[PDB]
Amino acid sequence: SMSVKKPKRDDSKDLALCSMILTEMETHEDAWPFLLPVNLKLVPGYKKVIKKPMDFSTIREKLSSGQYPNLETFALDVRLVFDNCETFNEDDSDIGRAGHNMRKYFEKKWTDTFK
């Protein structure tokens, strides 16, 4: 409260660390469904069903241009990618499997880097 501060995280390295994590996701061999935005013109149903599309290149642009206020808003966008993937794809599809794999991969990096 007013004039009563908790000790808080050293967050000075967060930008560099999120960038490193994003690089590792960009270079994962199962990253191919998530590298670019889904083509809303050519993929039936996607525009109407998926209210907030998100992909790695869009996250990269936002990270490079100061559009994440903190590391949690960054993690929300990464999770959005995989949440969207689960909404639109069968768990047994290649893309569905890719999504589950990448989520697991991300969350371990996240825990190991910040928790």
Ligand SMILES: CC(=O)Nc1ccc(C(=O)O)cc1
């Ligand atoms: C990220 C993502 O789900 N993208 C896509 C793209 C295209 C298809 C399809 O054509 O079936 C399915 C899923």
